[PDB]
From Swiss-Prot:
ANK repeat positions: 11-40, 44-73, 77-106
Full-sequence range covered: 1974 to 2104 of 2531
Organism: Rattus norvegicus (Rat)
Chain positions found as (3S)-3-hydroxyasparagine: 39
Region annotated HIF1AN-binding, chain positions: 31-39
Localization in the cell: Nucleus
Primary gene name: Notch1
Protein name, per record: Notch 1 intracellular domain
């Protein structure tokens, strides 16, 4: 009952996501290598991969991908990991995402494309990357 460690925080955060979000080097493989639900989501509908994107933890984004992470996963706001990458400006990580064929055409709840949020949030290099 050690898989019961898909234990969450009050807000749905799990160990993997912490690891992603906090970019803690080993626990990602530990958690993934221990068969941690790689598509677990916090109350907001965010996966490790999202969270890794948001913070641009390329490494994490890398491995999570390498191990079955739903790359086109949408959160409550329908924002995929790629999307947040832009919005926040995870250049390196958006590369990673597209390099894996992430659908740059999926839009959030306001029909905004990952390009619209990079453009808007003036993350120019992501704008062109998306192009």
């Amino acid at each position: 009952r050690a898989t019961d460690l898909d234990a969450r925080m009050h807000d749905g955060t799990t160990p993997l996501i912490l690891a992603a979000r906090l970019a803690l080097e080993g626990m990602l493989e530990d958690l993934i290598n221990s068969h941690a639900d790689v598509n677990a989501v916090d109350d907001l509908g965010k996966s490790a991969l999202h969270w890794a994107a948001a913070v641009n933890n390329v490494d994490a984004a890398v491995v999570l991908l390498k191990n079955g992470a739903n790359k086109d996963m949408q959160n409550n706001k329908e924002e995929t990991p790629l999307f947040l990458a832009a919005r926040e400006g995870s250049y390196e990580t958006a590369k990673v995402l597209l390099d894996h064929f992430a659908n740059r055409d999926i839009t959030d709840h306001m029909d905004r494309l990952p390009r619209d949020i990079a453009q808007e949030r003036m993350h120019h290099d992501i704008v062109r990357l998306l192009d």
